[PDB]
Amino acid sequence: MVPISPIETVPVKLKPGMDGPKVKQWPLTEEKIKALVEICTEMEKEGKISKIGPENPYNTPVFAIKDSTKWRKLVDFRELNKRTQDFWEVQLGIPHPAGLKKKKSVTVLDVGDAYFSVPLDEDFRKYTAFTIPSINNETPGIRYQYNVLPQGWKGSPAIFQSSMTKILEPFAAQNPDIVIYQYMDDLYVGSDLEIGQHRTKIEELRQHLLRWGLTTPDKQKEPPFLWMGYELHPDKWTVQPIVLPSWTQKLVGKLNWASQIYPGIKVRQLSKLLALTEVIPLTEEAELELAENREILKEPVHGVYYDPSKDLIAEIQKQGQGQWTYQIYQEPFKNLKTGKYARMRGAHTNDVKQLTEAVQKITTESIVIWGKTPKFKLPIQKETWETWWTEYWQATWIPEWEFVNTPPLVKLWYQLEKEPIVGAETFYVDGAANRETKLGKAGYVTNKGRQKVVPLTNTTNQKTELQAIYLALQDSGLEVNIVTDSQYALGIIQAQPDKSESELVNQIIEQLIKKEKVYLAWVPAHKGIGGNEQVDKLVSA
Amino acid sequence: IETVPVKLKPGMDGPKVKQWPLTEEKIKALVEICTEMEKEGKISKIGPENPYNTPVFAIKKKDSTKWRKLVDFRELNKRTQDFWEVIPHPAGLKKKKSVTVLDVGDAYFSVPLDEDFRKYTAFTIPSINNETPGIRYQYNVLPQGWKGSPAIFQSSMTKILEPFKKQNPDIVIYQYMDDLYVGSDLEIGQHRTKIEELRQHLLRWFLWMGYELHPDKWTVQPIVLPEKDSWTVNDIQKLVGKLNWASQIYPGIKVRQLSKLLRGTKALTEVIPLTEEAELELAENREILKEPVHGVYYDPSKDLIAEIQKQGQGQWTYQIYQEPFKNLKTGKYARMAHTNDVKQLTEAVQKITTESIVIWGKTPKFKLPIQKETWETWWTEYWQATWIPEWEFVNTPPLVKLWYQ
Ligand SMILES: C=CC(=O)N(C)CCc1ccc(Cl)c(Oc2cc(Cl)cc(C#N)c2)c1
Ligand SMILES: [Mg+2]
C-alpha cells in the first residue's frame, strides 16, 4: 500500500434551526427494487455508501430509472437541499473566450473518478440516509447513508471544485509555464512548451494526482471543445451555431447571445413587442432586419484570443433609435468580441449621454475579461466632448479616447446662451389649464408688443407651459430671449434632451436646432413680474 | 489576548455582497499584500462552507506610492451590533487652530478577533476573466474599516496616550475608525514636533503620514446679493428669484417693491433705475441675510445630508443639513484634475466627509450630481480615505445651483 494523502473534510451544517429530511419512501416495483439492490451493493463495495441501523430518523426518497443498457439510482435530495446551509458558489460568472490566451498544446485529462473520492463531513452523513423498499414490504427496507459528496446534493459542486483546487495549487505554483482549467469531470492543461517538455509536465501532474489516489485515465477530444455554449478552437472561438424557429419571446436571449461575436444583431423591434399568451405581427416591420438577423446569422463569424503584449481597443457606433454597436480588438478586423448597448428607458435623453453609458459598460466588461480598460475610438469630436462636459451640470468622464470619423457623428444639437441677448426680442410666455375641464391657454407677450394666446383642449398645466415656450420659438426670429415661470419646463430643457417621448418636447427641440441664439430665463410665478404678470392674466382664465 | 464577544444584530445574517471587478494591477497588489498578512496570521484562507462576502479593493494613500488594501465594510458595519461603553465627540476639535490626522490602522492588527465572528469578515481577491476561483480569506485580527475595531480597541488605545495627554492637557485627540485627529492651538513647527512626539509613543507602545487641516472656517456661508450701480431687467429678475428662494430660509424677505419694477414688458437687457422703495427693500433684505438662521440645532439621532453642485471651472458648492433649509454648514471648493470632473467630485466628497467627522463625529449621506453608472465605474480609482460614506444620485438639474453662486 502506497499511503494516499487524505482529502480534508469540509465541515457542513444544516441551515440554523432547520432539521434534516423525513420524506416517505415511495412505492416501487419488485423489478425496480431488484435493480437498486445491485447498484447499492457495488457502491457499498467502493466505500461510496454504508448500511445504517434503525436510529437515523431521516430518509430521502430513492427512485430507479432505466433503457440504454440498465437502471440507475436517482436519490431526490430536493428536501435535504432546502435544509442544508448556504455555500460559496466557487464561480458564478464564466470566463469569456475572448479572455483566453492561446497555447501551443492543450492536453485533456479525465478526473471523474475523483468526484466520488471526496469524503463527506462525518457529522453530516446522517442526513443522507435513504431506504430501498423491500420486496412485498415484508421486511425492513435496506438503509444506507453517503460517505461521499452525493450526486445532486446542494454542496457537492462547491465542495468538489474547492477540493480539486486545493490539490492542484502547489503544482500550478511550481509550474507557472502551464495553465489549468476545470470543467465537469475533465481538466485542461495547456502550455507553450515543446511537445515533449509538455507531455512530461502532464506526466508529473498525473503523478501529483496519484499522491491523493486520483486514478487519472491514460487515453483525444475534438479540436473544437464544446464548452458553455461556445466553440473553442486552437486559433479562434465562436458561438455554438444555434438558430430560432409563426405562433410565438426567447429569441431575445438567443439574438443577444449571438450578438457578442456577430455584428449588428438588432433586438429593438423584437424586444418592443413584449404571460405566455399571444404573438402579434411585427407592425414596426421588424422583418426588415429580422430577415437580416437571419441573414446576419447566415454567415459564420469567429473571434480571436487575447494577446497581452498588444494594446486593447474599443470602437463604438451609433446604430440609431437608442441602439449602439461596438467591437473590441487589438489588430483591425481581428475582433476579440462585439456587442450592443440599448438606451435606458426614460422620457428624454441625448446622444452624448448614451455614448457615455456605452463607454462605462465596455470599460467594466473589459476590466472583467482582460483586467484593463481599452483605448476607445469614438464617433464624437474632441471639441464636442469638451463643450459638453465643461457645461453639463453633472460630473462626467470618459477614459482615454480618440475621435473616429465614422458617420453618423454624435453632436450637440443646440446650446443655450448664458447671458441675455442684446437686441433680441424678449418673449414672456405663460400657460395654464383647468384641472376639471382640461381646458387651458398658452401664449406670450413681447417687449415689441407682439402677442398671442391659443386656447387648448385636453391639456394640463405642464403641457400648456411647454406650448407657450414652443409658441415663442415658432414666432420669433433667429435670436430670442424667453422668460418663463415653469420650473417644469426649465428642468426639461436644462437637462438638454435631443430626443423625447413627448411630441411637444420634440417640437421644441426642433425649434431649438433652427435658432442661432436662445436665452431661457426663469422667474417665479404670481409675483407680479411684469410681462409674466401681463401674460398670466391673458392665459389663466 | 481575550477576544471580546461580538455578534450581529438580532434577526440579521452576515453580508453577502458581490465583489466588483478589479484591474490586473490592483489584483497583483492585493495578492502581495494578502500573502504577507497571511504569513503574519492576520488573515487565513477559508473554504466553501463560508457564504459571506465583503468587497475589497486597493488604493494609494495621499503622498505615498505603496498600494493599500481597503475593505468596503459598509454592509458589515450596519449589521454589527452597536457597541457601547463610551466615543463622545469633542466640540473643541472643530475650534482648534490646527488638526493633524494620523493613520493608526495598523495598531488594530495586534488584537485577536472573536473566533465566532471572523466568518463574517470574508472577502475575495477576484481573478481576471473568472479563470481560477477567487482567493477567499477571513480576518483573524481586528480589521481596518470595521466599526467594532475602534470600539474594541478603545481599551488599549486610551493607555497608549495617557502620558501624552497628561503632558499636553489642552491638545485635543479624537478617533474615528482608523484615524486619529490631533488638534492644537500652536504653530505648525511645534505642531509637527508635538505630532512626531505622539508618533513616538505609537512606535514604542502609514504612521509616518498625516493631514494638515485648519478647522478655521466660517460655518454656514452668508447669502450674498449683488451691489450694482445699474440694474437691467434681467439682473432684477435673477435678484427677485434669489430673494424668493432665500424667503423659505429667512422670514420677512420681501420682493413687492422690486417686482413693481418688473411690471411692464421690457427687454431683458434694458437698464431699470431703482425706486426709493425698491432700494430700501433691498437694504432690509440684505440686513436680514447677515444674521444666520435661528432655529438651527443638530440632532445626533438623525442623518446628516450633504448636497454638492458642480459650479464649473473646478468650483463645487455644498451644503450639510438635516432638514431642508436649516443648513448646519455650507462651503465652496475651488481649483484642485482640471480635465477630470469625477476625480474632483471624489476629492470633494472626501473633504466634506473629513470636515463632517471633525464637527460631529459621523459621516453624511451624499446626494451626488452624477449618473450612478459613471460614479460606480470610477470613484474607487481616486479614493484615498480608509472610510466610505453613503451616496445617492441626482438626475434632475436643481434650479438652486445659481443661488449658491
Ligand atoms: C481550443 C482552445 C485552445 O486550444 N487554445 C490554445 C486557446 C484556448 C485555451 C487555452 C488554454 C487552455 Cl488550458 C484551454 O483549455 C480550456 C479552457 C476553458 Cl475556459 C474551457 C475549456 C473546455 N472545454 C478548455 C483553452
Ligand atoms: Mg407657465
Curated annotation (Swiss-Prot), chain B:
Known outcome of mutating L180I: 29% loss of DNA-directed DNA polymerase activity. 46% loss of RNA-directed DNA polymerase activity
Consequence recorded when altering I160L: 80% loss of DNA-directed DNA polymerase activity. 23% loss of RNA-directed DNA polymerase activity
Effect of Y176A: Almost complete loss of polymerase activity
Outcome reported for the amino acid change (mutating D103A): 5- to 12-fold decrease in affinity for dTTP substrates. Strongly decreased RNA-directed and DNA-directed DNA polymerase activities. No effect on RNase H activity. Loss of pyrophosphorolysis (reverse of the polymerase reaction)
Site for Essential for RT p66/p51 heterodimerization, residues: W378, W391
Outcome of mutating D103S: 5- to 12-fold decrease in affinity for dTTP substrates. Strongly decreased RNA-directed DNA polymerase activity. Slightly decreased DNA-directed DNA polymerase activity. No effect on RNase H activity
Annotated positions binding Mg(2+) 1: D103, D178, D179
Known outcome of mutating K61E: Strong decrease in RT binding affinity for all dNTP substrates and in catalytic efficiency. 100-fold decreased sensitivity to ddNTP inhibitors
Effect of P51G: 64% loss of polymerase activity. 57% loss of RNase H activity
Mutagenesis / variant outcome for changing L180A: 76% loss of DNA-directed DNA polymerase activity. 60% loss of RNA-directed DNA polymerase activity
Record note on what altering K61R does: 10-fold decreased sensitivity to ddATP and ddCTP inhibitors
Outcome of mutating V182A: 37% increase of DNA-directed DNA polymerase activity. No loss of RNA-directed DNA polymerase activity
Record annotation: effect of changing K61A: Strong decrease in RT binding affinity for all dNTP substrates and in catalytic efficiency. 100-fold decreased sensitivity to ddNTP inhibitors
Motif segment (Tryptophan repeat motif): 375-391
Effect of W378F: No effect on RT p66/p51 heterodimerization
Variant or mutagenesis effect after changing L70V: No loss of polymerase activity. No loss of RNase H activity
Variant or mutagenesis effect after changing W383L: Decreased RT p66/p51 heterodimerization
Effect of Y176F: 70% loss of polymerase activity. No loss of polymerase activity
Effect the entry attributes to changing D178E: Strongly decreased RNA-directed and DNA-directed DNA polymerase activities. No effect on RNase H activity
Outcome (variant: W375L): No effect on RT p66/p51 heterodimerization
Protein name: p51 RT
Organism name: Human immunodeficiency virus type 1 group M subtype B (isolate BH10)
Full-protein residues shown: 604 to 1027 of 1447
